[PDB]
Design an enzyme around this catalytic site. Structure first.
Site, PDB file in Angstrom:
ATOM      1  CG  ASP A  36      18.420  -4.278  39.205  1.00 33.04           C
ATOM      2  OD1 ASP A  36      18.893  -3.924  38.139  1.00 33.04           O
ATOM      3  OD2 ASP A  36      18.743  -3.709  40.268  1.00 33.04           O
ATOM      4  CG  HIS A 241       5.535  -6.339  12.100  1.00 30.80           C
ATOM      5  ND1 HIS A 241       4.863  -5.570  13.028  1.00 30.80           N
ATOM      6  CD2 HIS A 241       4.616  -7.191  11.578  1.00 30.80           C
ATOM      7  CE1 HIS A 241       3.589  -5.927  13.048  1.00 30.80           C
ATOM      8  NE2 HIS A 241       3.411  -6.901  12.174  1.00 30.80           N
ATOM      9  CG  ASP A 258       2.003   0.869  11.113  1.00 30.47           C
ATOM     10  OD1 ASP A 258       1.286   1.414  11.966  1.00 30.47           O
ATOM     11  OD2 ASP A 258       1.669  -0.221  10.562  1.00 30.47           O
ATOM     12  CG  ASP A 269      -2.410   0.529  13.661  1.00 28.66           C
ATOM     13  OD1 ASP A 269      -1.434   1.007  13.042  1.00 28.66           O
ATOM     14  OD2 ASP A 269      -2.844  -0.671  13.606  1.00 28.66           O
ATOM     15  CG  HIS A 348      -0.926  -6.699   5.090  1.00 23.66           C
ATOM     16  ND1 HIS A 348      -1.963  -5.810   5.226  1.00 23.66           N
ATOM     17  CD2 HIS A 348       0.111  -5.998   4.570  1.00 23.66           C
ATOM     18  CE1 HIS A 348      -1.589  -4.627   4.771  1.00 23.66           C
ATOM     19  NE2 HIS A 348      -0.328  -4.708   4.391  1.00 23.66           N
ATOM     20  CG  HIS A 352      -5.828  -4.890  12.759  1.00 23.82           C
ATOM     21  ND1 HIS A 352      -5.886  -4.111  13.894  1.00 23.82           N
ATOM     22  CD2 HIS A 352      -4.795  -4.413  12.016  1.00 23.82           C
ATOM     23  CE1 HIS A 352      -4.954  -3.176  13.827  1.00 23.82           C
ATOM     24  NE2 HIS A 352      -4.261  -3.358  12.719  1.00 23.82           N
ATOM     25  CG  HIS A 359      -2.743  -6.918  15.657  1.00 28.57           C
ATOM     26  ND1 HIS A 359      -1.597  -7.651  15.433  1.00 28.57           N
ATOM     27  CD2 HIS A 359      -2.704  -5.886  14.796  1.00 28.57           C
ATOM     28  CE1 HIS A 359      -0.922  -7.105  14.433  1.00 28.57           C
ATOM     29  NE2 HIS A 359      -1.576  -6.035  14.031  1.00 28.57           N
ATOM     30  CD  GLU A 382      -3.463  -2.664   8.639  1.00 30.91           C
ATOM     31  OE1 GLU A 382      -2.226  -2.539   8.544  1.00 30.91           O
ATOM     32  OE2 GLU A 382      -4.036  -2.893   9.699  1.00 30.91           O
ATOM     33  CE1 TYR A 386       3.756  -2.613   2.721  1.00 28.00           C
ATOM     34  CE2 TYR A 386       2.162  -4.253   2.003  1.00 28.00           C
ATOM     35  CZ  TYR A 386       2.510  -3.183   2.811  1.00 28.00           C
ATOM     36  OH  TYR A 386       1.544  -2.767   3.699  1.00 28.00           O
ATOM     37  NE  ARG A 403       1.000  -0.721   7.125  1.00 28.56           N
ATOM     38  CZ  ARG A 403       2.257  -1.201   7.123  1.00 28.56           C
ATOM     39  NH1 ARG A 403       2.702  -1.980   6.142  1.00 28.56           N
ATOM     40  NH2 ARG A 403       3.083  -0.960   8.143  1.00 28.56           N
ATOM     41  CD  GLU A 405      -3.001   0.769   9.970  1.00 27.06           C
ATOM     42  OE1 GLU A 405      -1.758   0.826   9.913  1.00 27.06           O
ATOM     43  OE2 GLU A 405      -3.587  -0.011  10.727  1.00 27.06           O
TER      44      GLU A 405
HETATM   45 MG   LIG Z   1      -3.002  -1.850  11.685  1.00 23.65          MG
HETATM   46 MG   LIG Z   2      -0.450  -0.107  11.464  1.00 22.80          MG
END
Ligand SMILES: [Mg+2]
Ligand SMILES: [Mg+2]
Ligand SMILES: [Mg+2]
Ligand SMILES: [Mg+2]
Lengths: 436, 436
Positions: A36, A241, A258, A269, A348, A352, A359, A382, A386, A403, A405
């Site tokens: 619940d 991710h 990130d 972001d 990637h 975006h 996104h 970004e 890797y 990365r 960004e």
């Molecule tokens: Mg991003």
């Molecule tokens: Mg990001």
């Protein structure tokens, strides 16, 4: 957002609609977390866009009679003393017309007895089909009452058209009021990233750094992140991710973070990568320098009239050149570019759209994102590299995920960087981390 | 939990099952937050209880041949390089028999081509019907294949029985390993509440105090709260599930904080109420003392052989006497009790079970919660009084919401309080806040 902002958006959508039509926009269902207990509510972005109303069990209908006449109806939860002692205050029907600038408000629990009457003998209804089951069932049951109701003089509109393309193209171009919110989200997100760099120590766990970030968001009135924070130390930074954030941060590894807050319904972001111990090794700095060159080239180039596709070509060139220098790639630069030989290491997109979703909605033109940039578009920048722990490369580069960004707004002359207040130069990072 | 703990639980369920049967336990679906972003995954409690496995798209089958012969099958996501570079590491089939102590593991995406073979010619299937649509779908499609396959000599089990009554009765009695986890959850939760008392100041926002608490949880390895935290200042404390946490904390108000961590899948759940400025007003203190006398008496009473119902009777009498002595109620004590005159001020239960869910599973016996208590049961103790701003009571009491809540384990002779390490005496509260 001001009343005028929301009314402008509703009127812009209404402008696209036909006479004798109605657009129906639904709130998000609640989400069970366990048994619940529910996750904290996140209103549907498009529903928020038009109303700023953050209750579930709410539906907005915009009815267009002709080019100078339209009106609105809201279905929403009833006032109820008992549910309100228990579960929190509700707007109700009496207060809703003035609060939300709608013409009429009706109880949500009557929606199935009332909606079909509202749609009776219209020509077109605009609905986001497939988005939520509960919404589809409501709309479709209404249309079936109308199809089966000839004896009651009922008729179903024959056409159902998605309003997402139109509303998403609206959301693609940010207003001044939206830019101001996104500015603050970017500043809050930067402050959090600076804090993580200041607090990071070998021996801390990845989730402890996430805790620093989330505490910073919350201080500034952004209770929730815009997406699950990535704190990827060492080989974990090579997973795009990575959100387990369960590992000890190791002396000698980089950590890639990130993170971005959701601030009044709009996302930051930011990604920054930095050495756990405050000093980049030579191999780390060398990969880092390529990524930094990429982002800085990108930040110089993004402007009206270029595209994500076009700036990406310049990034790829920088990457391929740099990877050859490090011995990660070999061969002729142009051939390696034509063969997209960077792809095992940069897999990637460069950018975006950014907005009420991280996104964000909006038409990129095609999968290569050749849409011509214009003022008011907001996007990430970004680049990353890797190098997997088992990559066929010189062993000193293995297990390095970097990365960097930032979030930018396209302006008349170029772009505004909303996240440049957290450092990215590797010497600046080292100096920041040495203060602490 | 140790491998042995999971074995013990699986064998205890198998002991209830019929020869020639299988129990099927499904993982939770993922939950969208917005567009393509998901909420942090929360495994289904019962699935976690039997596995410790925190991936979606996973199903455990426990097959019982007879009283001395059983076997297990797991369906789970396959190893896949690309999805794993993007989305995180997966267990896969090769590693699962050892990691999860199952006999066999198969790919989740083949479940519809495989499950019916596992259920063929069994007599009984145990499934939690109605819990998840996707799960009902899978199970009922398997059954239909069997019913319609007599040409292939297939036969469907003729009986479907819910395992929730059995497995929830198991979860109601905690093992040593579980109590040790709940102890640490209680301790982490108490440390967070202490910190909130130490940090609170007038002019801080409700959400900022929440941020303090959540940061503390995360420091100790409890990333997520077990439920959305309530920080209800002033009149907001009178709303039982107030989670907006959006108001300034005012000089002269109480703040009611209900917060608890989720630590290794188990919930703490503490409530403390205290003055925002560090000093109870006379009226705040008088009401507080009724609630404190209620929790202290309950803590003395809870032991094997009594029930939540029976303790609640004593609490209600304490409250009615208290409220009459302040003039908040008027009339004879027994009359008021018989008339349930306390209900406008104390309208919820004294106690709920506590475990892998904050409102834990387990049969209460009746709506008045007469289940006889036994060692191993874990429960909250949470009296409260909530005096509405428009209540017809002497006006100095209006707008006061107070709850005090600890988590206890029933023991052989009494109970152990897991959360007494955060103060509740009102003079201990004032002293603690004065130090700060
Ligand atoms: Mg991003
Ligand atoms: Mg990001
Ligand atoms: Mg509680
Ligand atoms: Mg409770």
């Amino acid at each position: 957002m001001t009343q005028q902002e929301y009314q402008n958006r509703r009127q812009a959508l209404l402008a696209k609609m036909a006479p004798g039509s109605a657009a129906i926009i639904f709130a998000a269902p609640e989400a069970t977390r366990s048994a619940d207990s529910e996750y904290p509510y996140r209103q549907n972005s498009d529903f928020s866009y038009l109303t700023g109303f953050n209750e579930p069990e709410a539906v907005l209908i915009l009815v267009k009679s002709d080019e100078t006449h339209n009106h609105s109806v809201l279905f929403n939860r009833i006032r109820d003393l008992t549910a309100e002692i228990w579960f929190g205050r509700r707007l109700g029907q009496e207060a809703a017309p003035t609060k939300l600038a709608v013409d009429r408000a009706l109880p949500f629990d009557e929606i199935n007895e009332q909606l079909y009457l509202l749609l009776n003998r219209l020509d077109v209804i605009y609905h986001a089909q497939g988005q939520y089951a509960y919404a589809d069932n409501i709309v479709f049951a209404a249309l079936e009452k109308l199809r089966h109701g000839f004896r009651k003089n009922l008729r179903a509109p024959a056409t159902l058209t998605d309003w997402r393309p139109w509303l998403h193209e609206m959301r693609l171009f940010k207003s001044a009021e939206e830019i101001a919110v996104l500015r603050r989200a970017g500043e809050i997100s930067a402050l959090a990233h600076t804090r993580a760099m200041e607090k990071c120590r070998p021996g801390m766990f990845e989730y402890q750094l996430e805790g620093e970030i989330l505490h910073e968001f919350t201080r500034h009135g952004a209770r929730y992140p815009a997406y699950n924070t990535i704190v990827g130390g060492g080989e974990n930074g090579c997973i795009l991710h990575y959100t387990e954030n369960e590992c000890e941060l190791r002396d000698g590894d980089l950590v890639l973070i990130d993170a971005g807050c959701e601030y009044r319904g709009y996302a930051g972001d930011i990604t920054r990568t930095f050495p756990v111990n405050g000093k980049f090794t030579p191999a780390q700095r060398a990969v880092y320098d390529i990524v930094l060159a990429a982002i800085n080239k990108s930040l110089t180039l993004f402007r009206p009239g270029t595209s994500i596709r076009e700036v990406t070509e310049e990034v790829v060139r920088i990457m391929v050149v740099g990877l050859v220098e490090l011995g990660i790639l070999k061969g002729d630069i142009e051939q390696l570019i034509a063969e997209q030989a960077h792809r095992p290491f940069f897999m990637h997109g460069l950018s975006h759209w950014l907005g009420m979703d991280v996104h964000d909605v909006g038409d990129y033109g095609s999968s290569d994102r050749g849409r011509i940039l214009e003022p008011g578009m907001v996007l990430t920048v970004e680049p990353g590299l890797y190098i997997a722990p088992d990559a066929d490369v010189p062993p000193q580069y293995r297990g390095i995920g970097i990365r960097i960004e930032d979030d930018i707004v396209i302006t008349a002359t170029g772009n505004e960087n909303l996240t440049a207040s957290v450092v990215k130069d590797p010497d600046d990072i080292e100096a920041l981390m040495a203060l602490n």
